[PDB]
């Protein structure tokens, strides 16, 4: 997998924020309609449901792309914590979970890059 | 001849600058005892001039350049007066909601801000956004006037400017400046940009390295032709001062391999002179 650029990070962060607010309104609908929201959506309120599925697919693909493109940063960070009790692959997987949290907590309206906030969350998950 | 180089550490790293009777200081920043071949860095020299302000656009007219690759350098022959238009860039990737100043007005150098970034040179702001992302911030450092609709020949964006010219009744113009209008939002401005005059010599002053040896079948004689790595089509986007050329040394000698070292050989006084020696040492067995 190749590495991203900065405008790619801005666009993927916009799509990730769209995905997270859609999941927020989905979670309050599950809290209201007793967990039967698989056929319910507030993004429309036949082709509209296909457009909604396409939008959800592109936002989930944007989140997975922003997570997948930054797995080299996890390997560059987790090579420092090598001999404290875990193996290398466990540190890589836990730092990947921290990178998932950093990708779902990123704010593109601050001007800062993704790598600093990602480094904070990856080191948090490893420790 | 006329060389004097010793150790001198005042501002930075290791620094072995030579002394010449033509009042020109020469230096190579690489380590003493290098291995070089033809078309390499041999020395360079400091410059009192050519300390530019920022980036800009260069379009030379009536001088020849001869190079194939842009990363090699052009062996310049003629001199001539060439262009210099100041234009400061900011190559960033922020958001348009991070933008703090309005486009089309005059800011001040240092005390201003362009999307959480402090300014360097006061001028007219130019902005380009593409996908709600601030791709660049352009600040052309020139004095700004506000007088539009002349009904005259003030549009002269092709040719240069003369101090005895007239573009409007009551416009101060002394230094050479290029003109193009500002399409301001509810504004009637027109900015002039301080074009600076640059010119270089035909061939640089350097004494010819005399040979006191046999020189049977071969001889060493290097020339110092400074290289151009700028062209017409490129515009430079430096946020700070960047030199155009370097007064530098290149050694050529006539596949072929060569390994040249440097030392300090002097048997006249207690000093160190310019010494660049080669000898194809064979190894006869003493046994």
UniProtKB/Swiss-Prot annotation, chain A:
A motif (Interaction with polymerase core subunit RpoC) lies at residues 90-93. It comes from the Bacteria. Residues 66-127 are annotated as: Sigma-70 factor domain-2. It is found in: Cytoplasm. Sigma factors are initiation factors that promote the attachment of RNA polymerase to specific initiation sites and are then released. This sigma factor is the primary sigma factor during exponential growth. Interacts transiently with the RNA polymerase catalytic core. Belongs to the sigma-70 factor family. RpoD/SigA subfamily. This is RNA polymerase sigma factor SigA. It comes from Synechocystis sp. (strain ATCC 27184 / PCC 6803 / Kazusa). The chain holds residues 83 to 254 of 425 of the full protein.
Curated annotation (Swiss-Prot), chain B:
The keyword Zinc applies. Keywords: DNA-directed RNA polymerase, Metal-binding, Nucleotidyltransferase, Transcription, Transferase, Zinc. GO terms for cellular component: DNA-directed RNA polymerase complex. GO terms for molecular function: DNA binding; DNA-directed RNA polymerase activity; zinc ion binding. GO terms for biological process: DNA-templated transcription. DNA-dependent RNA polymerase catalyzes the transcription of DNA into RNA using the four ribonucleoside triphosphates as substrates. Belongs to the RNA polymerase beta' chain family. RpoC2 subfamily. In cyanobacteria the RNAP catalytic core is composed of 2 alpha, 1 beta, 1 beta', 1 gamma and 1 omega subunit. When a sigma factor is associated with the core the holoenzyme is formed, which can initiate transcription. This is DNA-directed RNA polymerase subunit beta'. It comes from Synechocystis sp. (strain ATCC 27184 / PCC 6803 / Kazusa). The gene is rpoC2. The chain holds residues 534 to 827 of 1317 of the full protein.
């Amino acid at each position: 997998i190749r590495l991203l650029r900065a405008e790619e990070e801005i666009e993927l962060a916009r799509q990730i924020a769209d995905l997270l607010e859609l999941e927020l309104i989905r979670d309050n609908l599950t809290l209201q309609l007793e967990r039967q929201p698989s056929e319910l959506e507030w993004g429309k309120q036949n082709k509209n449901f296909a457009a909604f599925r396409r939008r959800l697919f592109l936002d989930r693909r944007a989140k997975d792309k922003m997570v997948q493109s930054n797995l080299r940063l996890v390997v560059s960070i987790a090579k420092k914590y090598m001999n404290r009790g875990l193996s290398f692959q466990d540190l890589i997987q836990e730092g990947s979970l921290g990178l998932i949290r950093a990708a779902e907590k990123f704010d593109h309206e601050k001007g800062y890059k993704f790598s600093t906030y990602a480094t904070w969350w990856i080191r948090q998950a490893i420790t | 001849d006329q060389a004097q180089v010793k150790l001198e550490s005042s501002g930075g790293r290791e620094q072995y600058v030579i002394y010449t009777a033509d009042k020109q200081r020469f230096l190579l920043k690489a380590a003493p005892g290098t291995k070089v071949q033809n078309h390499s860095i041999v020395a360079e020299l400091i410059d009192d001039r050519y300390r530019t302000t920022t980036g800009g656009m260069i379009r030379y007219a009536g001088v020849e350049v001869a190079k194939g690759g842009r990363k090699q350098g052009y062996e310049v022959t003629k001199g001539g007066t060439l262009l210099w238009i100041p234009e400061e860039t900011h190559e960033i990737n922020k958001d348009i909601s991070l933008l703090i100043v309005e486009d089309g007005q005059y800011v001040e150098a240092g005390t201003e801000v362009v999307k959480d970034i402090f300014c360097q040179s006061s001028g007219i702001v130019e902005v380009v956004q593409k996908n709600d992302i601030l791709r660049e911030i352009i600040i052309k450092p020139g004095d700004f006037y506000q007088d539009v609709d002349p009904g005259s020949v003030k549009i002269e964006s092709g040719q240069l400017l003369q101090p005895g010219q007239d573009v409007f009744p009551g416009v101060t113009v002394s230094t050479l400046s290029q003109a193009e209008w500002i399409e301001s939002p509810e504004g009637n401005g027109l900015l002039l940009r301080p074009v600076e005059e640059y010119k270089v010599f035909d061939e640089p002053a350097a004494p010819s390295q005399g040979s006191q040896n046999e020189e049977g079948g071969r001889q060493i004689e290097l020339r110092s032709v400074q290289r151009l790595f700028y062209k017409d089509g490129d515009r430079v986007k430096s946020v700070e001062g960047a030199p155009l050329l370097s007064t530098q040394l290149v050694l050529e000698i006539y596949s072929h391999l060569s390994a040249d070292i440097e030392l300090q050989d002097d048997e006249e006084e207690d000093c160190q002179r310019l010494q660049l020696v080669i000898l194809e040492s064979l190894v006869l067995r003493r046994d």
